[PDB]
Ligand binder design. Structure first.
Ligand SMILES: NC(=[NH2+])NCCC[C@H](N)C(=O)O
Length: 126
């Protein structure tokens, strides 16, 4: 990291802009959606600018591991398989209601505990 992000002055958020209404490319060519608005809010509250890094969906977790992005906010279902490799925020979208079915989370490298705690605070505030 959080201190490193604040020092850099920007948050790099990975997603795959092919999943409306969460992320998509609009009639103007800009990446927009629910997850973009959320990325912006987290950046705003960290005091930093946002850079969205668009990539193919399968590329996200490898990008997060190699530190090309700080977080994934890309309609990503919290799963036990993915918890082997990354940490998730608390869910921010409940596809099925009453916490059933797919719950979307923000993926963070397991080492970045500070950043995950902060993201969880933002989510509760929202
Ligand atoms: N931006 C995207 N293409 N997201 C696809 C998400 C599909 C499903 N929720 C998953 O986590 O695999």
């Amino acid at each position: 990291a959080i201190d490193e992000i604040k020092s850099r002055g920007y948050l790099l958020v990975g997603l795959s802009a092919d999943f409306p209404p969460f992320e998509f490319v609009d009639e103007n060519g800009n990446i927009v959606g629910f997850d973009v608005d959320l990325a912006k809010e987290i950046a705003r509250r960290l005091g930093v600018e946002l850079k969205i890094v668009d990539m193919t969906f399968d590329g996200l977790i490898p990008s997060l591991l190699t530190k090309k992005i700080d977080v994934i906010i890309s309609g990503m279902t919290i799963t036990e398989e993915r918890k082997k490799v990354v940490a998730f925020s608390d869910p921010y979208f409940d596809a099925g209601g009453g916490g059933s079915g797919e719950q979307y989370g923000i993926a963070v490298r397991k080492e970045d505990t500070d950043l995950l705690e902060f993201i969880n605070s933002v989510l509760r505030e929202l």
